[PDB]
Amino acid sequence: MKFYIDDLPVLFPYPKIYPEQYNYMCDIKKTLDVGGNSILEMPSGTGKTVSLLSLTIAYQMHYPEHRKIIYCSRTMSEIEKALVELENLMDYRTKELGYQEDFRGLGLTSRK
Amino acid sequence: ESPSLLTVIIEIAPKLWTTFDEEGNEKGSIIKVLEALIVFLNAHLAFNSANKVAVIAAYSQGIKYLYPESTSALKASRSDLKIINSDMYRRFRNVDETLVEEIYKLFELEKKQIEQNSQRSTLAGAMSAGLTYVNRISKESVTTSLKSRLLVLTCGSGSSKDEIFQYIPIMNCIFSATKMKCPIDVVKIGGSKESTFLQQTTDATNGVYLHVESTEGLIQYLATAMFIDPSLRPIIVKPNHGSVDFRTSCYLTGRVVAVGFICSVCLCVLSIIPPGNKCPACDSQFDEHVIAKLKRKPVVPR
Amino acid sequence: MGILDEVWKHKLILVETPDAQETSLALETYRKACSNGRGAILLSVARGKVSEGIDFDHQYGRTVLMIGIPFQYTESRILKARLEFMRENYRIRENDFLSFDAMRHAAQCLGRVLRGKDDYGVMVLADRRFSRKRSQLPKWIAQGLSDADLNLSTDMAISNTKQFLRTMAQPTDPKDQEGVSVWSYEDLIKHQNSRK
Amino acid sequence: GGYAWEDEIKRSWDLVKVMASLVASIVEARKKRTAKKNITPYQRGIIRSLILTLDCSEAMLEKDLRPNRHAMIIQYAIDFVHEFFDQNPISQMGIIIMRNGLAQLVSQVSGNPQDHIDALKSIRKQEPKGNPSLQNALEMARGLLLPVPAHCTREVLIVFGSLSTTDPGDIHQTIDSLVSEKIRVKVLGLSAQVAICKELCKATNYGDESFYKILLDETHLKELFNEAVTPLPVNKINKGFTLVKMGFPTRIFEDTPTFCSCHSKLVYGGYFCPNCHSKVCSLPTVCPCCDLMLILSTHLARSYHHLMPLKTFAEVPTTEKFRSEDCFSCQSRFPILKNHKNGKLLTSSRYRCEDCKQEFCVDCDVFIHEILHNCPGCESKPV
Amino acid sequence: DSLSKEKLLTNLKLQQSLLKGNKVLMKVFQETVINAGLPPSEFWSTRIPLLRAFALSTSQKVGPYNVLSTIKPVNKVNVNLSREKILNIFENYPIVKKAYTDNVPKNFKEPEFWARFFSSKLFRKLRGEKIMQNDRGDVIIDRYLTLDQEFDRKDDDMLLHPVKKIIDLDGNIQDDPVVRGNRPDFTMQPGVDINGNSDGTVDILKGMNRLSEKMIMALKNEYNDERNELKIDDLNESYKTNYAIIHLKRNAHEKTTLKVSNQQMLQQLSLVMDNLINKLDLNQVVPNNEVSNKINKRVITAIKINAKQAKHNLEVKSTLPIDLLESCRMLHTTCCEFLKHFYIHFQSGEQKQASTVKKLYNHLKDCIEKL
Amino acid sequence: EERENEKTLNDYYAALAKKQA
Ligand SMILES: [Zn+2]
Ligand SMILES: [Zn+2]
Ligand SMILES: [Zn+2]
Ligand SMILES: [Zn+2]
Ligand SMILES: [Zn+2]
């Protein structure tokens, strides 16, 4: 769907959203407006990764600062899962906006 | 042994009985069939002390329970009219007086509403109402093991032809009566010897079909062949001669169907392939490949 | 003793080998065996390679059998030196930090089983020392853990698991979850208007 | 450091602490009535070829179902065969069991319910054993449903008792083959939700996940067995709308026994085929001499009520002026209906129809929903 | 495949075996195919589902399982080896079947071979039991042990394959290639002996993993996805039913092979009214003993007809002897079979097979002559 | 006795195998 958090339009790649996802995005946007460190225990099962990706891409493209995004995980498999979720999110964004915006997303790992 | 419930579905229509009076030599056959029914109900109530009687009349504008009376009407009532003599047995007298009082009220309603001529027969709805009452008497279970039996006193009189709209409700009543093991006896008073739907009703529900041409001596027919109690049904043979073929009429031609084709969607029976390659009932388009095989001519060498 | 012989009658056994390549083959064989209805058991270390990153959602999960609390080797010198460092500097008790690390590894392995609110899986903890560590569990896990389940036996746990699996094998009512567990766009708009 | 015996007495007697109860029952009844509001004349496949797959494994020896699982499934399958052939006469049915990893076909696909009853009675004596094979049963049913004509719907009912299955091959290829052959599979499970059964039901039923059903208790198993006798609603993409050729035989009467064309035995009565004048024992069956379906008008009539189902009757408002104090179909007096002291005529038992607006009691309402299939008020209306 | 109709028709051995099993189908076959000259392909054309059922009764096979785990003893101890258990051992363990082929037809009998195998170290190794040097094993079977290890190596030769990055546990430890952190303790490492060598308990884990992988891979025979895997189906829209709806027209045609006026209607109604006012004498229902005779005759004649019809209705007993009755039954059966084939070929509608229709007509004429 | 019957069926198997081949 497409919904607004304050002045930030958020493109969520699913037709339904968990309430915990919306509260998570509200807290992340409040933290980014503050600009400090924070710890958020987003419960498993719910869309922890997809909410993070959707809100941070919405914050990056809409705001004129266009701050870059670093996503650090613990395993390469989780990096690939985050890349897949990001691919689905930007496919939804391309479908909704009607065009593929200037965007670059890559996963970094070893030579092996 | 076991008491039974006799539910009587009588089809009294002023247009139907007038045609029978005009065709016959006598007039006022409604009185004759009513008094024969009254004697038959007194006979049924004499069979066992605990048996019950239900009488429902199907008139032109609807149906109405003749016996017992409406509970609102019973609470409202009691003018004991002298249609039936008061010196008889009180158990018979209450039923007979209630029945003739409701005949009086229903004929007053028919006389009031005589200006509107109805083209919709309500016999099947009356049979459905009788089945609901039979289920109520079984479901109520005030009395242990009540059995049951429908008796439909209908009249055709050579005027009312076969009614194709009645087919599905009569079949549903057949299946319901077979489910609750309720035999359906049918008495037809008129010149139409064959009534296919009612004959199927008697045959499929282990009932007795009886067609008569004169209303005189009707109690001799009822007390002899329609007096088959549900307790003694398997041990007494049924005189229902003229076995029905259990066939059906075609949808677009109306004739009784031979080897034929039905729609796989709505089960409507077609004597021939319908024009336009579409079902006339549910508008389902047929494949041209499969119907060519039905249209394919059989093979033999030259 | 032949415990595994009875397990082979129901589910295939796949064990986390130290080799990461053979472990990947065992994991994909486990995923294949859960899909076709053969049924499989996957034995792994709660602090191992399978414990981190790998998810077990829907048929891949359905039961997380915890054999004890995953405590570290206490007699190791590195762990004791680190515990003394945290006690000296950050005033963290050694037993408190050991319980914290063990319960966070247990918490991550319990959290690997869920993806989506339609997903389900039981979280069984087979040790006597888990009972005092209910407050060290994550908050969302702690809400689901009732007080009557803190000292269950084996047979009571089996009966509760069977009742639970029979319970969600029924289809859930959408009207019971239309706007309380998952929100549409209209429900989100209504909640936003209720918040202001 | 204490002991359990040194504690205070449980005092369970002191723990026990002692209208509108009809309102509390009728709100649950209204929730039951609300679930029946989804009345649609969906197109259903009348002619069916049902394959009943019954588990006969070691998990059938579990005693969570009285008295054992295997006997109850066989008895309820007997009742299911009776109900299915009572409501779907034209439909054929076969019985397959999964025993010792093998699919054993115990009764061929035929329209005679007596053979299936005898087969189920024979299977009831034997003891279930082995590890069941879903793929073997699916392949056997696929072989059975191959000669089924395109107009006749191909359905499989799998009563799966175990939680794991052992297959000799890839079950996903079998699922894809069943999808390619338009075979719809409904699985009733006994213990829990098996993922392969859910995937099979979802693939065979065009994404519908509601065809995988799991019981809760004894009566839920009865309700799930009684739910499967109804024909499944067909998809819009199905275009197999073919005319089916059959004749309506006449019940021949003769005092001399004759050889029937189907069993070659001496039977007095019979039904001569309208196409080739060959007699049969029972109906509805194919004609053994010309491969023609032989049905009666009642066999077609049994499945009309699925094609035009009745709309569910509406609960009358309490403040609305009632047409009749008593019932219409059975003239039962509606009671005082005072659930509490000032209830008055709250949740009045009258059920208003959507066309004739007649009043029916709860007994008549559940009787029309079960045995009858036509509203008496809609027929008493002089249309 | 083998289940196609042309394969069932041409499978002569399967038809012979089905004849050997069956008895009631024999009487139809033997009196029609050869004794009456019916073609054999025509006979099995109508019995295709029976042939398919008989083929699938023996063609199906059980799924793979840990057969050696089920084998356990029960001083004398006895173990029962079924033939299907032997086949499952051969299928699950090709090393045992390799030892079976070069020893049993050559040196010793099959039960001696199995008793040697069960007392050998190969059975303990393949069962997952730890191998100890105190056991004697069996010197004939143990020669294959090293070769069995080679087979295990060759097992990896068709088990090792690249996997998806979702479950790529190899790349997780190789994500940091120059990591040189603290070495994990001995609790996180495989067990070692006093000399530092492995105790062999890691080999049985690889053994059971290899067994599970082999049983899964045996299912893989002739008998973008990460996006679909990571998608949350709960957050997607619910499935909408696409079931077709039908509206049935009830405008059927009427069945085909003196209207009263409202005035005389009301006059007849009022006549019934006044006949109900004055006296409803019920004693008028008594017949005059003349029409009652006609009613009694009609009812008794109907009863006689119905009772003569329903006097009589496992087959009923016949007055014919058992020798003549069976001859009539078999001749009726072959006449019905010929009639069924004739109607199938007649209503099939294929002009290319009209010669078969002519032959079946000649056969029906011969059946008329036999009757 | 069915033994003579199954012997006749075996002879018929031999005859059918001879004729079909
Ligand atoms: Zn149609
Ligand atoms: Zn027969
Ligand atoms: Zn025929
Ligand atoms: Zn009622
Ligand atoms: Zn109505």
Side-chain angles (χ1 to χ4, degrees):
Chain A
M1 65 183 73
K2 181 172 189 295
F3 57 94
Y4 282 79
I5 304 180
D6 310 336
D7 47 353
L8 182 61
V10 187
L11 283 170
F12 195 65
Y14 290 100
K16 291 194 295 294
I17 182 180
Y18 292 142
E20 302 89 11
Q21 297 176 299
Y22 173 72
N23 302 136
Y24 188 42
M25 301 185 191
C26 287
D27 291 312
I28 294 164
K29 193 195 170 306
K30 287 175 182 61
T31 311
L32 293 188
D33 296 350
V34 168
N37 309 340
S38 172
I39 288 187
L40 294 174
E41 186 198 325
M42 192 46 208
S44 79
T46 49
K48 164 194 57 58
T49 301
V50 55
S51 313
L52 270 162
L53 292 176
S54 311
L55 191 77
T56 56
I57 299 302
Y59 200 95
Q60 174 187 77
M61 311 305 278
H62 166 259
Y63 277 77
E65 279 81 15
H66 291 80
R67 304 184 55 179
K68 286 182 176 298
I69 303 167
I70 319 294
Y71 200 93
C72 306
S73 181
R74 57 177 313 171
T75 48
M76 181 275 268
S77 58
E78 279 188 357
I79 294 160
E80 169 65 26
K81 289 190 303 179
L83 282 175
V84 166
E85 290 275 353
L86 185 59
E87 279 184 353
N88 293 330
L89 161 77
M90 311 296 298
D91 284 3
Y92 181 82
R93 287 183 65 95
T94 306
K95 175 178 300 179
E96 283 291 325
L97 300 185
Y99 71 104
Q100 179 184 17
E101 58 265 31
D102 188 19
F103 195 75
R104 293 281 198 186
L106 273 178
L108 171 60
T109 186
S110 63
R111 292 185 174 90
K112 176 60 192 301
Chain B
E1 183 176 5
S2 59
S4 63
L5 164 67
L6 175 58
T7 299
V8 171
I9 306 304
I10 186 167
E11 184 183 10
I12 61 170
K15 44 168 300 181
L16 282 180
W17 288 112
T18 311
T19 45
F20 179 73
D21 292 4
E22 290 291 329
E23 288 288 332
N25 51 86
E26 83 287 337
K27 303 296 164 291
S29 300
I30 298 169
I31 293 292
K32 314 300 168 299
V33 62
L34 196 66
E35 64 177 354
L37 174 57
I38 285 168
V39 178
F40 183 64
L41 292 181
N42 294 333
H44 172 262
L45 287 168
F47 186 84
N48 191 278
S49 301
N51 45 27
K52 297 183 178 180
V53 167
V55 186
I56 295 98
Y59 55 96
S60 59
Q61 307 297 138
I63 61 179
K64 139 174 172 175
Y65 270 72
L66 293 186
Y67 182 80
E69 269 174 0
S70 172
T71 70
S72 57
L74 295 174
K75 183 178 179 180
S77 64
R78 312 188 181 271
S79 60
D80 189 15
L81 197 43
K82 292 313 169 63
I83 301 179
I84 317 295
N85 50 71
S86 58
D87 54 343
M88 71 184 327
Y89 190 31
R90 288 300 304 177
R91 283 189 68 254
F92 302 150
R93 179 55 152 80
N94 297 355
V95 183
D96 297 358
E97 178 72 19
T98 304
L99 188 137
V100 300
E101 165 184 355
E102 296 304 312
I103 300 299
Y104 205 90
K105 284 180 173 54
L106 190 149
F107 283 166
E108 286 278 354
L109 193 142
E110 283 184 351
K111 170 181 178 182
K112 184 64 63 184
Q113 184 62 255
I114 197 66
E115 55 92 20
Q116 167 58 224
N117 304 119
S118 168
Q119 286 78 27
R120 187 73 54 181
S121 173
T122 61
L123 183 60
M127 293 177 70
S128 305
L131 282 171
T132 60
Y133 189 87
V134 159
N135 184 221
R136 164 207 185 177
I137 299 304
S138 160
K139 269 187 79 284
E140 183 178 2
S141 83
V142 290
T143 70
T144 59
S145 191
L146 177 63
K147 299 296 183 181
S148 58
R149 179 167 99 261
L150 289 171
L151 170 70
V152 179
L153 311 178
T154 179
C155 51
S157 72
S159 58
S160 60
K161 286 301 180 179
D162 194 14
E163 305 292 332
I164 51 176
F165 71 94
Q166 298 178 357
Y167 168 74
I168 298 103
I170 300 299
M171 295 299 103
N172 291 354
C173 289
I174 286 173
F175 298 137
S176 172
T178 313
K179 172 65 181 302
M180 64 183 73
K181 303 187 302 176
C182 172
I184 302 183
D185 294 331
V186 169
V187 167
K188 186 181 183 62
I189 305 168
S192 181
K193 172 65 179 60
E194 303 288 332
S195 183
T196 60
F197 293 158
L198 278 296
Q199 277 171 289
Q200 284 185 75
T201 316
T202 51
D203 211 328
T205 61
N206 205 28
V208 189
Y209 182 80
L210 175 59
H211 169 256
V212 294
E213 65 271 58
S214 300
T215 182
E216 55 91 19
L218 189 51
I219 188 56
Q220 182 61 219
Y221 271 115
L222 299 182
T224 308
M226 311 295 98
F227 208 63
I228 306 178
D229 202 78
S231 180
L232 57 87
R233 276 275 160 177
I235 58 180
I236 296 298
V237 304
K238 303 176 299 300
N240 47 350
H241 79 284
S243 173
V244 68
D245 45 1
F246 276 108
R247 289 172 177 267
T248 179
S249 62
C250 167
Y251 192 86
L252 73 164
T253 66
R255 59 185 59 182
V256 63
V257 69
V259 292
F261 321 99
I262 66 169
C263 177
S264 60
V265 180
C266 71
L267 307 176
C268 78
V269 191
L270 315 175
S271 55
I272 51 179
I273 294 92
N277 299 324
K278 193 175 57 183
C279 169
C282 75
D283 307 324
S284 300
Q285 179 63 39
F286 298 145
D287 183 26
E288 292 86 9
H289 173 37
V290 57
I291 62 183
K293 305 307 183 62
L294 306 180
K295 277 290 196 59
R296 194 153 64 178
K297 203 75 167 182
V299 285
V300 64
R302 305 291 83 79
Chain C
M1 45 196 293
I3 301 299
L4 300 181
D5 293 331
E6 198 168 354
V7 190
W8 278 114
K9 302 183 59 181
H10 307 274
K11 296 185 182 304
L12 310 185
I13 306 177
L14 282 158
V15 193
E16 178 188 17
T17 64
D19 186 20
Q21 273 286 347
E22 298 174 1
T23 310
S24 65
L25 273 68
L27 182 63
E28 64 96 8
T29 314
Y30 171 81
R31 272 170 167 258
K32 279 187 175 180
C34 292
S35 301
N36 51 12
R38 179 63 60 85
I41 179 173
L42 180 70
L43 315 168
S44 171
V45 190
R47 319 179 66 89
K49 317 173 300 298
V50 187
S51 61
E52 47 182 8
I54 295 306
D55 47 350
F56 299 93
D57 51 338
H58 308 90
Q59 67 277 338
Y60 305 139
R62 292 319 186 201
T63 298
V64 183
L65 178 55
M66 281 265 188
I67 301 298
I69 315 190
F71 275 105
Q72 303 189 22
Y73 187 58
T74 309
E75 308 288 333
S76 56
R77 314 292 303 189
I78 309 299
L79 177 63
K80 295 189 295 182
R82 190 201 177 184
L83 282 175
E84 288 174 1
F85 190 84
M86 311 215 78
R87 180 247 305 170
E88 168 61 42
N89 292 108
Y90 311 100
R91 305 142 305 272
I92 302 178
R93 310 277 86 88
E94 297 90 357
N95 301 330
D96 292 7
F97 188 80
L98 282 177
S99 187
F100 160 71
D101 174 69
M103 294 299 291
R104 80 179 178 180
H105 274 252
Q108 83 163 349
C109 290
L110 290 190
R112 287 319 173 190
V113 73
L114 285 187
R115 165 172 274 100
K117 293 190 180 180
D118 58 332
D119 197 357
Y120 56 92
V122 309
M123 321 203 176
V124 292
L125 308 171
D127 200 298
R128 52 175 302 274
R129 304 162 286 179
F130 274 111
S131 56
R132 296 286 308 277
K133 311 300 179 61
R134 194 254 285 274
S135 58
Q136 302 180 8
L137 271 171
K139 185 178 182 301
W140 63 273
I141 305 185
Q143 298 315 111
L145 180 48
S146 61
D147 310 344
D149 296 330
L150 296 183
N151 45 4
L152 288 184
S153 67
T154 298
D155 62 358
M156 293 177 71
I158 294 304
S159 60
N160 294 355
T161 309
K162 289 181 61 179
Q163 175 62 33
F164 183 80
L165 286 170
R166 188 158 299 188
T167 307
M168 292 180 183
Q170 308 301 315
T172 180
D173 189 25
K175 301 300 183 59
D176 205 13
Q177 64 174 7
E178 46 185 352
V180 295
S181 70
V182 63
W183 284 346
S184 180
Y185 175 60
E186 292 87 10
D187 307 330
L188 183 54
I189 290 299
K190 284 172 58 179
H191 181 87
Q192 283 180 334
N193 298 333
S194 72
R195 283 198 73 254
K196 44 184 70 65
Chain D
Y3 280 123
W5 312 277
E6 293 168 336
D7 304 345
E8 187 62 31
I9 318 294
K10 306 177 181 179
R11 214 183 280 252
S12 303
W13 47 94
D14 205 8
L15 303 183
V16 176
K17 299 304 185 302
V18 297
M19 294 300 293
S21 61
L22 275 297
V23 182
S25 61
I26 209 67
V27 289
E28 169 66 32
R30 207 57 50 86
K31 299 154 194 171
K32 187 72 157 60
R33 290 305 180 180
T34 316
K36 308 305 173 182
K37 295 178 57 59
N38 47 4
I39 175 65
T40 52
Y42 282 164
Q43 177 191 351
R44 306 174 180 272
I46 296 304
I47 319 176
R48 294 165 65 186
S49 190
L50 184 62
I51 297 301
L52 175 56
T53 297
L54 294 176
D55 199 10
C56 290
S57 60
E58 292 177 7
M60 282 334 297
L61 291 172
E62 190 171 351
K63 290 183 182 294
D64 57 325
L65 265 55
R66 297 284 75 78
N68 65 91
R69 278 182 172 181
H70 170 265
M72 166 183 211
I73 300 299
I74 287 298
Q75 291 293 139
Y76 275 46
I78 286 174
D79 306 358
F80 172 76
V81 163
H82 274 296
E83 187 76 21
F84 180 78
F85 278 93
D86 181 68
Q87 299 195 359
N88 297 61
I90 310 168
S91 305
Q92 301 180 3
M93 182 215 285
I95 312 292
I96 313 181
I97 58 176
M98 313 162 309
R99 176 189 180 86
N100 296 329
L102 299 179
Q104 180 181 2
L105 167 65
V106 310
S107 80
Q108 287 277 354
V109 187
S110 181
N112 185 25
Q114 188 58 43
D115 307 329
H116 307 335
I117 291 306
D118 297 0
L120 289 182
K121 283 185 175 180
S122 62
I123 297 300
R124 194 213 291 107
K125 295 179 175 55
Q126 82 176 18
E127 180 190 19
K129 51 181 305 301
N131 207 356
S133 175
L134 262 179
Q135 190 194 18
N136 284 332
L138 284 188
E139 282 176 357
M140 182 146 298
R142 170 177 177 266
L144 281 185
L145 292 180
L146 188 54
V148 167
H151 58 83
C152 182
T153 61
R154 307 177 178 183
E155 302 175 7
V156 176
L157 182 61
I158 299 180
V159 182
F160 195 60
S162 310
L163 286 180
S164 63
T165 174
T166 48
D167 306 329
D170 192 11
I171 197 174
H172 295 272
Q173 307 295 326
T174 313
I175 289 181
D176 295 359
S177 68
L178 288 188
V179 168
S180 71
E181 292 148 346
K182 271 82 70 177
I183 294 180
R184 311 186 61 177
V185 182
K186 167 187 291 295
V187 175
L188 313 179
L190 289 193
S191 303
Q193 180 261 330
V194 190
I196 188 53
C197 305
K198 175 244 184 180
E199 183 72 28
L200 164 68
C201 290
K202 188 175 177 180
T204 46
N205 293 270
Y206 324 112
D208 206 331
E209 306 95 358
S210 58
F211 286 83
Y212 192 22
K213 292 295 195 181
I214 308 295
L215 73 165
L216 283 174
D217 55 352
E218 295 293 328
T219 63
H220 203 184
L221 186 62
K222 182 171 294 299
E223 290 292 328
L224 284 180
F225 263 104
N226 291 15
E227 199 266 344
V229 304
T230 70
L232 306 182
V234 302
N235 206 327
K236 194 184 303 299
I237 58 179
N238 291 319
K239 312 300 293 179
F241 306 147
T242 80
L243 282 171
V244 189
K245 182 177 181 180
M246 72 291 291
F248 292 83
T250 55
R251 181 171 52 186
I252 192 58
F253 283 163
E254 186 75 280
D255 49 351
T256 301
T258 52
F259 282 98
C260 61
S261 299
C262 56
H263 304 89
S264 299
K265 59 191 300 179
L266 277 300
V267 183
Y268 271 45
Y271 303 94
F272 268 58
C273 174
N275 167 259
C276 75
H277 294 174
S278 49
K279 61 171 303 180
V280 296
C281 294
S282 175
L283 297 177
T285 54
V286 289
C287 182
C289 288
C290 65
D291 207 1
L292 176 77
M293 191 35 78
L294 300 181
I295 64 180
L296 295 179
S297 184
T298 66
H299 298 138
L300 278 179
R302 200 66 178 87
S303 303
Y304 271 115
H305 76 278
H306 299 132
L307 311 169
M308 70 285 278
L310 293 188
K311 299 171 296 178
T312 177
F313 299 146
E315 183 75 20
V316 300
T318 66
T319 60
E320 182 260 355
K321 174 59 184 58
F322 313 123
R323 297 178 47 180
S324 173
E325 187 175 0
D326 55 341
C327 184
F328 163 76
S329 44
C330 77
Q331 62 168 357
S332 297
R333 185 198 296 266
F334 294 100
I336 55 170
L337 293 161
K338 296 175 69 66
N339 307 144
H340 53 295
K341 191 255 292 179
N342 44 64
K344 314 302 169 57
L345 297 158
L346 191 150
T347 176
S348 169
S349 176
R350 318 177 163 78
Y351 270 99
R352 178 153 300 114
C353 183
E354 280 67 35
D355 299 344
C356 56
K357 311 293 168 52
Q358 293 284 348
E359 282 69 32
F360 309 105
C361 49
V362 295
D363 306 357
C364 281
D365 199 16
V366 305
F367 166 68
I368 298 180
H369 294 341
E370 287 181 354
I371 300 171
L372 272 183
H373 298 288
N374 50 344
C375 176
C378 294
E379 313 182 12
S380 63
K381 177 181 179 180
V383 180
Chain E
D1 297 328
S2 179
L3 294 185
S4 63
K5 182 182 180 181
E6 52 94 16
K7 283 299 182 181
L8 277 296
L9 285 174
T10 55
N11 204 324
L12 264 61
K13 181 57 182 180
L14 186 69
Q15 298 163 14
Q16 287 280 347
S17 58
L18 180 56
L19 287 192
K20 182 182 302 178
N22 198 288
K23 310 302 177 182
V24 295
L25 190 149
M26 184 63 72
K27 180 64 175 181
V28 187
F29 191 96
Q30 71 175 7
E31 302 307 317
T32 312
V33 179
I34 299 101
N35 290 336
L38 181 80
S41 64
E42 182 63 37
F43 189 86
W44 298 112
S45 305
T46 66
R47 311 175 191 274
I48 289 297
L50 274 78
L51 276 171
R52 285 177 179 172
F54 195 69
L56 288 177
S57 172
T58 62
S59 70
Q60 58 182 358
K61 55 184 180 180
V62 300
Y65 65 101
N66 201 341
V67 61
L68 281 189
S69 286
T70 61
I71 295 300
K72 51 184 60 181
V74 190
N75 192 21
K76 304 174 59 179
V77 285
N78 290 82
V79 63
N80 291 318
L81 288 185
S82 302
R83 188 57 54 182
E84 49 264 11
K85 289 190 173 302
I86 299 307
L87 296 185
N88 286 134
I89 286 177
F90 287 161
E91 287 174 355
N92 291 264
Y93 304 93
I95 175 63
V96 186
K97 193 190 64 179
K98 186 63 176 300
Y100 184 89
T101 46
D102 49 5
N103 281 89
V104 177
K106 189 181 300 301
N107 298 330
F108 35 82
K109 292 175 178 54
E110 176 177 339
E112 185 175 356
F113 167 73
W114 285 115
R116 286 175 184 274
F117 165 67
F118 276 173
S119 58
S120 176
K121 306 176 187 179
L122 181 60
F123 168 71
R124 292 130 182 84
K125 175 180 183 62
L126 290 177
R127 214 197 179 276
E129 306 284 338
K130 299 188 64 179
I131 174 167
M132 283 73 74
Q133 308 297 135
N134 70 329
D135 189 19
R136 63 189 189 280
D138 181 273
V139 294
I140 301 185
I141 313 294
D142 288 332
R143 297 177 294 104
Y144 301 89
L145 288 173
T146 66
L147 188 153
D148 168 73
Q149 295 183 349
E150 169 191 351
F151 275 175
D152 301 329
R153 261 70 178 180
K154 293 208 303 182
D155 283 1
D156 309 340
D157 294 2
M158 73 291 291
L159 283 171
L160 176 61
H161 64 269
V163 302
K164 296 180 297 299
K165 301 294 185 179
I166 310 290
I167 51 183
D168 194 13
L169 283 170
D170 192 18
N172 287 335
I173 70 172
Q174 297 291 336
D175 191 274
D176 196 0
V178 292
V179 54
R180 278 175 296 184
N182 293 127
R183 185 170 302 181
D185 49 306
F186 74 107
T187 69
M188 295 296 172
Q189 295 176 355
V192 290
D193 291 326
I194 184 70
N195 310 334
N197 58 279
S198 298
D199 44 358
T201 182
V202 71
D203 297 328
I204 72 178
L205 302 190
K206 304 185 188 308
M208 51 175 38
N209 288 13
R210 180 184 297 107
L211 190 52
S212 303
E213 286 165 1
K214 280 197 300 179
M215 293 182 286
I216 285 298
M217 185 202 66
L219 316 182
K220 299 288 188 175
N221 44 17
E222 302 299 320
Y223 185 79
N224 182 81
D225 308 336
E226 54 270 353
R227 289 189 175 186
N228 308 327
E229 290 179 1
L230 272 296
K231 267 175 183 180
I232 300 169
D233 300 330
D234 186 69
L235 283 195
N236 288 324
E237 279 295 271
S238 59
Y239 170 71
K240 296 179 58 57
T241 62
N242 208 19
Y243 298 139
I245 189 167
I246 46 179
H247 313 85
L248 316 188
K249 302 169 170 173
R250 299 191 179 183
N251 46 5
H253 186 268
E254 300 292 328
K255 193 182 70 181
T256 49
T257 181
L258 299 177
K259 305 177 182 178
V260 294
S261 80
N262 282 14
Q263 313 304 316
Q264 61 179 356
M265 208 156 155
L266 196 48
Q267 295 298 139
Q268 195 264 354
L269 282 176
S270 302
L271 169 65
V272 176
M273 291 305 337
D274 58 63
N275 200 17
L276 199 65
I277 292 296
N278 48 7
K279 173 64 64 179
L280 188 55
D281 188 18
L282 277 297
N283 203 26
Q284 304 295 326
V285 307
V286 182
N288 46 26
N289 208 14
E290 189 265 328
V291 287
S292 85
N293 306 332
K294 182 254 291 179
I295 296 173
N296 286 170
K297 287 154 192 166
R298 176 160 182 260
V299 170
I300 295 299
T301 44
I303 283 159
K304 283 184 179 180
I305 290 302
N306 293 25
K308 195 62 181 181
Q309 178 50 49
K311 188 155 61 66
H312 308 279
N313 53 2
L314 177 59
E315 61 178 1
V316 300
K317 297 191 59 56
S318 172
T319 70
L320 276 80
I322 194 66
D323 194 17
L324 180 59
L325 179 60
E326 291 301 317
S327 63
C328 296
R329 185 188 314 270
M330 61 79 71
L331 183 62
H332 167 86
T333 309
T334 182
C335 282
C336 281
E337 187 77 21
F338 272 118
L339 194 66
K340 175 182 189 58
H341 296 317
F342 174 77
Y343 272 107
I344 280 299
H345 275 287
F346 191 72
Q347 305 181 1
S348 54
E350 301 293 327
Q351 287 282 345
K352 57 182 184 62
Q353 65 183 177
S355 59
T356 65
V357 188
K358 172 187 174 181
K359 289 188 301 178
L360 285 170
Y361 164 72
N362 296 136
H363 288 158
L364 279 188
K365 278 303 180 60
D366 295 331
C367 285
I368 290 178
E369 296 154 5
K370 289 158 193 175
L371 278 186
Chain F
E1 182 69 273
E2 190 276 331
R3 306 305 176 183
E4 287 83 18
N5 293 115
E6 63 96 12
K7 280 302 180 182
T8 50
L9 269 70
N10 193 23
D11 297 345
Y12 202 91
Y13 296 146
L16 169 62
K18 181 266 290 180
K19 182 185 180 64
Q20 201 167 18

